[PDB]
Amino acid sequence: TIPHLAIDPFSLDFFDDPYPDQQTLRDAGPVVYLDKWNVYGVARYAEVHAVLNDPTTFCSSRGVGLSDFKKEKPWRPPSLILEADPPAHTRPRAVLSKVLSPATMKTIRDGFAAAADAKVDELLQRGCIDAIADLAEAYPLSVFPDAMGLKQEGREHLLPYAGLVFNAFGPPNELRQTAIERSAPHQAYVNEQCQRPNLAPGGFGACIHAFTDTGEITPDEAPLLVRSLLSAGLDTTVNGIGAAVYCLARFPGELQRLRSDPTLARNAFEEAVRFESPVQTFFRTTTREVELGGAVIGEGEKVLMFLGSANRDPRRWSDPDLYDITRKTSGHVGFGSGVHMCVGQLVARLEGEVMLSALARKVAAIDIDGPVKRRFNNTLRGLESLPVKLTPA
Ligand code: HEM
Numbered sequence: 001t002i003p004h005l006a007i008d009p010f011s012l013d014f015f016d017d018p019y020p021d022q023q024t025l026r027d028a029g030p031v032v033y034l035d036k037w038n039v040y041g042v043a044r045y046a047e048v049h050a051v052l053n054d055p056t057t058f059c060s061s062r063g064v065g066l067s068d069f070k071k072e073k074p075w076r077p078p079s080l081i082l083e084a085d086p087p088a089h090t091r092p093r094a095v096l097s098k099v100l101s102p103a104t105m106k107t108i109r110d111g112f113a114a115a116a117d118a119k120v121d122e123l124l125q126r127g128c129i130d131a132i133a134d135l136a137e138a139y140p141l142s143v144f145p146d147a148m149g150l151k152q153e154g155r156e157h158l159l160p161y162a163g164l165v166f167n168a169f170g171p172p173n174e175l176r177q178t179a180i181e182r183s184a185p186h187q188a189y190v191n192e193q194c195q196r197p198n199l200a201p202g203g204f205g206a207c208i209h210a211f212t213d214t215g216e217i218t219p220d221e222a223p224l225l226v227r228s229l230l231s232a233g234l235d236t237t238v239n240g241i242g243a244a245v246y247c248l249a250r251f252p253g254e255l256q257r258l259r260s261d262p263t264l265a266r267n268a269f270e271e272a273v274r275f276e277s278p279v280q281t282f283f284r285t286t287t288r289e290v291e292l293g294g295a296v297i298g299e300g301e302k303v304l305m306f307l308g309s310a311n312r313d314p315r316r317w318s319d320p321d322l323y324d325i326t327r328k329t330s331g332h333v334g335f336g337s338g339v340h341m342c343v344g345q346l347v348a349r350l351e352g353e354v355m356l357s358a359l360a361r362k363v364a365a366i367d368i369d370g371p372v373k374r375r376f377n378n379t380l381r382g383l384e385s386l387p388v389k390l391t392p393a
Pocket residue numbers: 060064081082083093096100228229232233234236237239240273277278279282307333334335336337339340341342343344345347348
């Protein structure tokens with residue numbers, strides 16, 4: 001009853017151009033079986049949304065990668081939020097929600113905006129830049145480690161560690177194995193900075209530790225929640241901003257609409273998150289036998305959700321393959337949906353908004369003017385190098 005497919009959604013050929021295979025995955029049926037990895041997959045919007053919003057059956061505490069924590073040791077101690085179910089999930093989630101709250105955004109907005117403006121002006125002086133190293137990576141590196149309250153020393157480990165985290169959600173392919181092998185120095189660096197003495201007062205890290213006073217988290221929980229921010233909080237924004245710039249480079253008409261109304265910056269970023277879906281995939285594990293898409297899935301089965309596919313499903317989206325900065329983007333699943341929906345979404349959107357605002361006000365044209373290279377990661381979609389010429393407004 002369930003179609004079996006041989007598509008490897010973690011192969012380099014798939015990362016290189018996922019969209020035809022994602023259609024094949026959607027059109028095969030509401031639920032497929034991926035023989036390459038012995039997992040179920042859901043690629044249409046409806047089922048992906050349903051699974052995300054059914055946490056008691058499609059759980060996270062057995063891992064949101066391919067590995068089942070009931071069967072194998074996690075490569076690092078489980079995340080107290082990503083890899084937890086309610087009720088255990090709830091108070092750590094509440095702490096990060098408060099640390100990354102609307103109120104907190106007021107404290108960092110001016111500096112985040114100023115750094116974005118300054119960066120775009122700097123790049124305009126250079127003219128021909130790499131929109132990944134010089135913009136998508138450089139801008140988040142210039143604000144987020146500081147906002148965390150990290151010391152200067154060791155920050156070169158941040159992106160490698162994130163690359164590892166996101167590769168490690170994948171199957172045990174070469175990408176994952178190469179990432180985990182000799183990763184100890186990255187792990188040691190991150191784990192050390194999660195300890196309270198190493199985090200600057202006023203920053204997100206210190207604020208997490210401050211919540212141990214309230215009874216919401218214990219002191220021994222705080223370093224793991226700092227670890228969550230150091231795992232998710234940088235590389236995501238790199239690929240989100242890179243996605244947006246790549247979109248604006250490919251859709252000059254939309255750059256021009258953005259220029260004409262910079263207040264479209266926030267939605268132009270949201271649309272980029274839908275369109276590229278920097279976080280492509282997550283898994284759940286069934287806690288019980290369950291019928292999904294007329295398919296009966298046993299207990300303890302891994303279910304692969306194709307977030308990017310869901311965000312391009314023509315059943316849900318008009319012209320899914322068009323980048324439209326005035327699209328009603330609400331309901332996209334690029335930040336997830338339900339109890340685990342991205343708790344750092346205000347930080348992500350703030351960064352994206354203020355960079356796209358700076359571009360909107362300062363740049364007339366973005367032209368790809370060198371070889372484009374894709375960055376391969378089991379979970380993250382994005383580019384390694386994006387040479388562009390920036391024309392000033
Ligand atoms: C464009 C940028 C980002 C994207 C696309 C993204 C994507 C996602 C997605 C899809 C989830 C849901 C996970 C699931 O359902 O299993 C999620 C959760 C999460 N994200 Fe974001 N994220 C981004 C930025 C950030 C930032 C900037 C931070 C921190 C400063 C962050 C921290 C987290 C954390 C801690 C969770 C787990 C929340 C929970 O389990 O309740 N992410 N993110």
